[PDB]
Symmetry: D3
Subunit: 153 residues, 6 copies
């Protein structure tokens, strides 16, 4: 119930993996001071993706999104820290890469909406839902970062 | 074809002198834009008076043409979806004082007369600046191996 | 080239900045921006120094915990010089509150919480002159001409 | 094929703690090797004793297992021509004292007990370590978009 | 003048395709070498066949030319003290298997047929390769603002 | 505290060409990311007398007078770094004294070219390092603290 232990779901999409951005993206979260809790590599099924993007069932791009997210492996991640959901999105940049600012992950590394390299949860509620959807509870590891007292007061 | 749009980017003589050529090209590559043209030359004053012809009546114009002739520049053509507008965002505000950190100008320079880089401000200007600095046979068209992961 | 280009600001890397190994990365950003380094030292600031440094915050509820924490480890104190370096230096640092710091800034990229914002920079020219005189003796500020001066300033 | 060789790379608990996961993964990506498996776990002691089974009688074995159990690791499988041998070169000498600048250990660590990373020393060891740390359901095979530009 | 030695560096089609152009130029800039020529082109097969004329009897020659012609390349001239020999050191062993981490091929490529870059092996070869790839009009000479901090 | 070998110190000086070419942050970052601990740091124009004492073993060599004049000609970053075998490993990190022999990935291998502009100096021995540290720094300028990752750097 601690603010500093909030968690978010970050997924590196198949274009991110294919273009070699996995380390660069993870690096950005480490240097910010957030803590890695969950990490895995899989080719997501369409049933998983249909559940993940369930709020978009009725959008013309939903079919192409589900099937594109299936077309290659993704990196699934859970990161933990104070306001990690909100600050994650800031670090990611705007969902539509056209408006992402240089310095953000999307603003620095991608161009088009169908190919926006990354996803991050839009709310603490979406996060807990997405974490449970992609991770099993035993796949989430907690540890104390040696630099915790220098990240948090 | 929206994905084939081109913009002219020029690394100005201070950008070449301060060692920023690779860093600037690296940013356009890692963004996903595709290099089409690349040369290194000391631009002539006639070329520069035509490049900055809209500034002909401004009090800084003669100094701009003269300074831009004082060293070699790196002339580039980049291709991609909305590469003109997005390229300008990557460059930062023309005035380095208002450039945001993360942009080329925000990270790498300070003052307006030494703003290290230029990019076309419109599709119409890009087409003119490309034809002004590059000959058609100097612009190379190839398919990036990541084309299907950059564009849907 | 002008003496407006001689403006100076005080930048201090806080104990969290030193502990988390950001000293080089921070100095790099000022170097690659074109600012010139004028003073650089490494010390554990005394409480008298810190209280005088944050004299304007003497009546703030976080003052005692700010002064003790800044004393709890060593800091890197720097003086940088350049046109509008005070204002531009605050832009590079990002918002004082890390939550509002944009990506691309020092705080937006490297820290999370207000008590641990890794870096301080003078907020005005008057603050800078008072802070530089507070942390650096005149003999510890070195002036030299950058080989790139003529390509940074017109 | 030869280009489908695989090695097991594990980022030890000190590399996770010191914020090295991204940097390490970047070096394998930019080298051109392909990521096949990736997980984050706290290895059990039983797994670690089988992983280091050739060291049962070394005076550091018990402390090595205990240290490798003290915190989570990142476990990885990478694929490519000679990834086992080249992987070890990238890592640097097992003892960081001897690792050259430019390697992971040469750049990032100091002491043998805290050498941030492990990589299989042979194709035999790799296959054994991959089977030990990964199940078939965790190994993803995809075709990199740059394959024909990394390989003949 | 010894500090005026020049070498020819070519970023091969795989280096362009995998987005390494900026990273490579950066390494030469930060070392303190000076860019003298820079161009982007698709090399004709006649040019490539003369460039590699010493290799025409090797079994790999036909496929080397095809690979070197399969996409555009970035051709470059770089000037500095012992730039021919030191460029090779920076590039790494021609065979990427032998290249050390910290070199260009050591950090970025794997296989002999896709080794991302070429540098002249001698001053004599350099003068030949430069004349072959660059016309006199395409070379620039300027004083680097750091020359006196690079060279006593 | 740890074993006393973990507390060895070396003197590192970023020369005027290191400062002029914008390498200060890059150099410090390599020492930080390697695990070593920063113990002293100052910016100054060293007097020729200081430099003649620093290089006293070279006082009769043909390059000595110009090396002394050159090192005085602009400001230097003087640092003290602490860690296991930091003297020897620091020298490996810097690369060979002659830049032409310095391998890529080292400080001199990546960033410079010629003998008289080799951007950096590091102590060559423990004994040298004690002498240079005392020459360049007063003891009250050397700061002792515990690195938060010490248990992950040292066994
Ligand atoms: O609140 P948001 O701004 O995040 O909502 P949004 O922009 O409307 O988009 C929500 C999700 O739908 C995706 N999305 C939006 N438009 C899309 C399109 N034309 N094609 C494929 N996917 C699209 C976005 O990537 C995002 O998922 P992601 O979070 O996965 O990007
Ligand atoms: O909309 P814009 O920002 O492009 O218009 P602008 O700010 O008026 O300036 C457009 C071009 O004129 C240049 N420019 C503006 N003021 C200048 C000055 N005092 N000295 C030298 N150049 C100047 C800018 O660098 C820019 O060229 P560049 O695009 O070459 O920077
Ligand atoms: O105008 P500013 O935005 O700089 O003023 P401010 O945000 O109100 O804070 C000014 C100084 O007090 C610090 N400060 C503000 N709130 C704090 C808090 N809750 N706890 C500890 N320190 C705090 C800031 O880090 C800053 O010092 P720093 O400049 O050292 O960050
Ligand atoms: O041929 P190798 O270099 O692999 O053999 P080696 O040098 O004897 O080391 C083999 C493994 O034992 C570890 N190892 C060696 N000496 C150690 C020590 N004093 N303390 C803790 N671990 C030690 C190494 O880090 C390495 O595992 P890792 O591969 O996990 O480093
Ligand atoms: O002395 P060198 O190392 O340059 O001699 P070398 O190893 O025999 O190679 C000389 C040239 O032939 C190329 N080369 C050698 N073997 C090759 C092979 N199996 N396939 C394709 N190219 C090959 C090298 O890339 C190099 O050109 P490059 O310099 O262009 O690599
Ligand atoms: O063992 P070393 O390699 O350090 O001994 P060395 O190469 O003879 O030189 C030791 C010191 O003298 C400097 N030194 C050697 N030859 C020099 C020359 N021709 N010109 C200017 N300085 C020179 C070195 O850079 C070094 O100082 P630095 O340590 O400051 O480089």
């Amino acid at each position: 119930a601690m603010a500093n232990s909030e968690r978010t779901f970050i997924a590196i999409k198949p274009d991110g993996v294919q273009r070699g951005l996995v380390g660069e993206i993870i690096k950005r979260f480490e240097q910010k001071g957030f803590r890695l809790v969950g990490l895995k590599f899989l080719q997501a099924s369409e049933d998983l993706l249909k559940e993940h993007y369930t709020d978009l069932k009725d959008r013309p791009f939903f079919t192409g999104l589900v099937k594109y997210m299936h077309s290659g492996p993704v990196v699934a991640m859970v990161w933990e820290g104070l306001n990690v959901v909100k600050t994650g999105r800031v670090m990611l940049g705007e969902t539509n890469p056209a408006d992402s600012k240089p310095g953000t992950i999307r603003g620095d590394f991608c161009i088009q909406v169908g190919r926006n390299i990354i996803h991050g949860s839009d709310s603490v509620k979406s996060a807990e839902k997405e974490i449970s959807l992609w991770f099993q509870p035993e796949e989430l590891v907690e540890y104390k970062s040696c630099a915790q007292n220098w990240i948090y007061e």
